[PDB]
From Swiss-Prot, chains A, B:
It is found in: Mitochondrion. The chain holds residues 60 to 166 of 166 of the full protein. One of its GO terms (molecular function) is protein-disulfide reductase activity. The record marks 35-36 as: Contributes to redox potential value. One of its GO terms (biological process) is cell redox homeostasis. It is linked to Combined oxidative phosphorylation deficiency 29: An autosomal recessive, infantile-onset, neurodegenerative disorder characterized by decreased activities of mitochondrial respiratory complexes I and III, severe cerebellar atrophy, epilepsy, dystonia, optic atrophy, and peripheral neuropathy. Disulfide bonds join 34-37. GO terms for cellular component: mitochondrial matrix; mitochondrion; nucleolus. Belongs to the thioredoxin family. This is Thioredoxin, mitochondrial. Coiled coil: none annotated. The modification N6-succinyllysine is found at residue 96. It comes from the Eukaryota. It comes from Homo sapiens.
Length: 110, 110
């Protein structure tokens, strides 16, 4: 569990690394068939990586983990949730630029 | 198999029942996390059923069939393609009503 950016591997994996996380979490709902995920994905990844443990990123492939999309009421991809202490505390849908992502992550972190 | 409306089971099933069909085909890209597909889905189904063999409906769950959504450049759900002799001849995205679905099917069938 060394990396701040990680693919969610199952149901238990989500409960331990997101719902019971000790840091704030960005949750990226994505799919292989969605163009804008290939841009937003790496962009947010590098931005979260630069924070060195102040925020983590849980990537959720919507095709691999259709239950999590159902639970979190994801209606479209890309969907990113900010989570803290189990609670959803912010959300966007779609592509954001680097100034936008910085603003989102500073609002979450403090 | 006797039904005009069916779930696509795999890759070979798509090749047999869509690419090599001798009747026009409506292809419904849907997902269990997508609200609007619970409306459009049965609505299209009923209207296809009433044409008695003049058009076929191939349902494709995108989470069970990621390859097909990459191939056909599906970016969001509901996506419906109209297909004839292996080729995409019309497209819509999102819900339509029964008047609009009637026009879409008359454009494809004749």
């Amino acid at each position: 569990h060394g990396s701040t950016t990680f693919n969610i591997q199952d149901g238990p994996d989500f409960q331990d690394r997101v719902v019971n996380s000790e840091t704030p979490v960005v949750v990226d709902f994505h799919a292989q068939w969605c163009g804008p995920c290939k841009i937003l994905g790496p962009r947010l990844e590098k931005m979260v990586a630069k924070q060195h443990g102040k925020v983590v990123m849980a990537k959720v492939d919507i095709d691999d983990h259709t239950d999590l999309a159902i639970e979190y009421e994801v209606s479209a991809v890309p969907t990113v949730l900010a989570m803290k202490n189990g609670d959803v505390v912010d959300k966007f849908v779609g592509i954001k630029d680097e100034d936008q992502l910085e603003a989102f992550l500073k609002k979450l972190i403090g």
